[PDB]
Amino acid sequence: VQDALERALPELQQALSALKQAGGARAVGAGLAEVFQLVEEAWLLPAVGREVAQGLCDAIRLDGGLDLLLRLLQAPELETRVQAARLLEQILVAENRDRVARIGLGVILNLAKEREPVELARSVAGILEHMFKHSEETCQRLVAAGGLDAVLYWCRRTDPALLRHCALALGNCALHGGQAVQRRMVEKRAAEWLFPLAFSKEDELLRLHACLAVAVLATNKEVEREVERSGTLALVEPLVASLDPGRFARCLVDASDTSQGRGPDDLQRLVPLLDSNRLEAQCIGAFYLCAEAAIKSLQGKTKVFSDIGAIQSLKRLVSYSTNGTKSALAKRALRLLGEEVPRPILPSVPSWKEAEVQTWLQQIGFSKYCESFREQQVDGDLLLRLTEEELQTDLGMKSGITRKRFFRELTELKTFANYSTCDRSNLADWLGSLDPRFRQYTYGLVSCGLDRSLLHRVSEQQLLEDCGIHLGVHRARILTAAREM
C-alpha cells in the first residue's frame, strides 16, 4: 500500500524545498498551507491514514523540517505563527515530540503567552497537548511553568475547539505526568475549573475529556478529597451511562478527532483505569475502550487490544462486576472484539461448594482436573487454603507451569473475592488500603484468626508459616504497616 507514499513523497519534498526557499511571508504562508493540506489528506486517508501520516512526519523530520517550522514560528507576523502551529500540531508524532522536547522548549511557552489570538491559541493548545503526551520530565518542566496558566486561561474561554484541546491536554497531563504533577495540577484548582467544562452541556466531547481527566486524577488516592469536592465525580457516571458507544462510533466520523483510531500508547495509558478501584474511572475507561473497539472493528483490527492486554482486564471486570453500566460496557466491548462473554462469578468464595468450584475451574479452562476436585470434594475454604504440595500431589498437577497458572488464577480470585462471611474487622479493607493485591492474603490471616488489634504483635515467622505469605517483600510491608497500630 506504498503507492500513496510514492504519490505524496515527491510532492512533499517539492513543498519542503519551496518552504526552505520561502523567505518572503507570502511564500512561507503558501508553502505552509500546501504542506498542511498534504498532511491533512494523509491523515484522512481511509483505514491507512495513520501509517502514511507517520511516514510523512518522518520525511518532515529529515531535511530539518522541525527546525524550519520553529524558525517560521518565531517570526514577528502572526500568520506565520498560526500556519506553522497548525502544521506542527498535525505532525507531532512521538519522534517529533521528543525532538521538540529536546530543542524547542521555551519558544513554545513564549508564544503561548500570546493568549489573545484564539486562532493561534487553538494550535498552541494542540502543541502543548501533544507535548503532554511525551515523557514525564517534560511534563514537570512544561506543566510547572507554562502548563497550568495557559491551559486554565484558555479553559476560561468559550471557543469549542480550544476548550476541547485544553481538556485533551489536561487528560494527557494526568496520564503521562507523575503523581507530583497530578498533585500540583489539583492544587492549582484545575478540577474546579474543569467542573463547568464537564457541566457545559454544549459538547459531549469536552465533557467526556473532562470526565476522563477527573477520573485519572481520582486514581491518585492523595488528592481525591478536593477532587470529589469539585462535584464532577457524581457527574461522570450519568454522562457515560447516557451515552451510547454505537452512537459515538457512528459519530466522530465527520469530526475526525479520533476517527482514524487512537494510538496504541494512548490505549495502553487508558488500560490502568479499568483496575483502579474507582467506579467512575472504570466507567470512563470502559466507555473509551468500547468506542475504540468499535472504531477498530470498523477498520478491521482487533489484535492491538490483545497486544495492549485490555482483554484480560475486561474479562476480569466482567467476572467481578457489581455495577450494571460497567458490565454492559465491558460485554459490549468484548462482543465488539468478537470475544467470549464470561458469566459473572459468585463472589462468596469462602462459602463455595463443589458446584461453584467446578464452574470456576471450567471458566479458567482447567477441565482436565475438574473431576479430581469433584473427587476431592474441594470447596471454598480448601480452595482458598490450597498449597503447592497439595495441588501437585493430591490433585495431580505434576508440571510446575500448570501449577503456576493455577496459582495465578487463584491469586486473582482471592484478590477480587468477598470475605464478608468470615472476617469482621474488615481486614480485607485494610490490606487493600495498603495494596489491592494484598487482599489475596486476607483469608489466610482470617484462617489464622488474626485481628487488626492483634496485628501489631504478629511476627515474620507467623506471617510466613501460619499465614502462608510466601513473598518476603509483602511480609515486610505488612509487618511495617501493622507495627504502626
Ligand X SMILES: O=P(O)(O)OC[C@H]1O[C@@H]([n+]2cccc(S)c2)[C@H](O)[C@@H]1O
Closer residue to a second copy, CB minimum distance, 154 or 248: 248
Task: Name the minimum Å distance from CB 122 to a second copy.
Answer: 28
Q: Which of 69, 143, 198, 458 binds a second copy (CB under 8 A)?
A: 458
Task: Name the minimum Å distance from CB 116 to a second copy.
Answer: 32
The residue count for binding a second copy (CB under 8 A) is 74
* Tally of residues, the chain: 485
* Residue 332 engages ligand X in binding (rule: CB under 6 A): no
* Residue 141 engages a second copy in binding (rule: CB under 8 A): no
Q: Is 418 annotated as a binding residue?
A: no
Grid coordinates representing 278 are 474507582
HEC string of the chain equals CCHHHHHHHHHHHHHHHHHHHCCCHHHHHHHHHHHHHHHHHHHCCCCCHHHHHHHHHHHHHHHHHHHHHHHHHCCCCHHHHHHHHHHHHHHCCHHHHHHHHHCCCCHHHHHHCCCCCHHHHHHHHHHHHHHHCCCHHHHHHHHHHHHHHHHHHHHCCCCHHHHHHHHHHHHHHHHHCCHHHHHHHHHCCHHHHHHHHHHCCCCHHHHHHHHHHHHHHHHCCCCHHHHHHCCCHHHHHHHHHHCCHHHHHHCCCCCCCCCCCCCHHHHHHHHHHCCCCCHHHHHHHHHHHHHHHHHHHHHCCCHHHHHHCHHHHHHHHHHCCCCHHHHHHHHHHHHHCCCCCCCCCCCCHHHCCHHHHHHHHHHCCCHHHHHHHHHHCCCHHHHHCCCHHHHHHCCCCCCHHHHHHHHHHHHHHHHCCCCCCCCCCCHHHHHHHHCHHHHHHHHHHHHCCCCHHHHCCCCHHHHHHHCCCCCHHHHHHHHHHHHCC
Q: Is 92 annotated as a binding residue?
A: yes
Amino acid at 416: F
Q: Is 43 annotated as a binding residue?
A: yes
* Residue 242 engages a second copy in binding (rule: CB under 8 A): yes
Of a second copy, ligand X, none, which one sits near residue 91, judging by CB under 5 to 8 A according to partner kind? ligand X
Binding residues for a second copy restricted to 326-385, rule: CB under 8 A: 346, 348, 350-351, 353, 376-378, 381-382, 385
* Residue 237 engages a second copy in binding (rule: CB under 8 A): yes
* Residue 130 engages ligand X in binding (rule: CB under 6 A): yes
Q: Which of 256, 348, 377, 393 binds ligand X (CB under 6 A)?
A: 256
Of a second copy, ligand X, none, which one sits near residue 144, judging by CB under 5 to 8 A according to partner kind? none
Q: Residue 51, Cβ neighbours under 10 Å: how many?
A: 13
* Residue 405 engages a second copy in binding (rule: CB under 8 A): yes
Amino acid at 167: A
* Residue 241 engages a second copy in binding (rule: CB under 8 A): yes
Cβ-based neighbours of 309, under 8 Å, separated by 6 or more: 271
Q: Which of 91, 128, 168, 215 binds ligand X (CB under 6 A)?
A: 91
Q: Is 132 annotated as a binding residue?
A: yes
Stretch binding ligand X (CB under 6 A), from 86-94, 158-166, 310-318, 392-400: 86-94
The residue count for binding ligand X (CB under 6 A) is 13
Closer residue to ligand X, CB minimum distance, 90 or 138: 90
* Residue 92 engages ligand X in binding (rule: CB under 6 A): yes
Q: Which of 4, 50, 61, 481 binds a second copy (CB under 8 A)?
A: 61
* Residue 260 engages ligand X in binding (rule: CB under 6 A): yes
Closer residue to a second copy, CB minimum distance, 15 or 469: 469
Cβ-based neighbours of 325, under 8 Å, separated by 6 or more: 237, 240, 241, 283
- What Rg, from alpha-carbon coordinates, does the chain have? 27
| Stretch 270-309: interaction string toward a second copy, x if CB under 8 A | -xx---------------------------------xxxx
Identify whether the C-beta of residue 172 lies closer than 8 Å to the C-beta of residue 129. Answer: yes
Binding residues for ligand X restricted to 365-394, rule: CB under 6 A: none
Task: Name the minimum Å distance from CB 95 to ligand X.
Answer: 9
Grid coordinates representing 118 are 484564539
Task: Name the minimum Å distance from CB 19 to ligand X.
Answer: 18
Q: Residue 396, Cβ neighbours under 10 Å: how many?
A: 12
Closer residue to a second copy, CB minimum distance, 97 or 164: 97
Q: Is 352 annotated as a binding residue?
A: no
Binding residues for ligand X restricted to 32-71, rule: CB under 6 A: 43
Q: Is 111 annotated as a binding residue?
A: no
Task: Name the minimum Å distance from CB 105 to ligand X.
Answer: 17
Closer residue to ligand X, CB minimum distance, 260 or 313: 260
Q: Which of 80, 90, 182, 442 binds ligand X (CB under 6 A)?
A: 90
Stretch binding ligand X (CB under 6 A), from 2-10, 85-93, 270-278, 411-419: 85-93
Task: Name the minimum Å distance from CB 237 to a second copy.
Answer: 7
Q: Is 210 annotated as a binding residue?
A: no
Task: Give residues in contact with ligand X (CB under 6 A).
Answer: 43, 89-94, 130, 256-257, 260, 263, 266
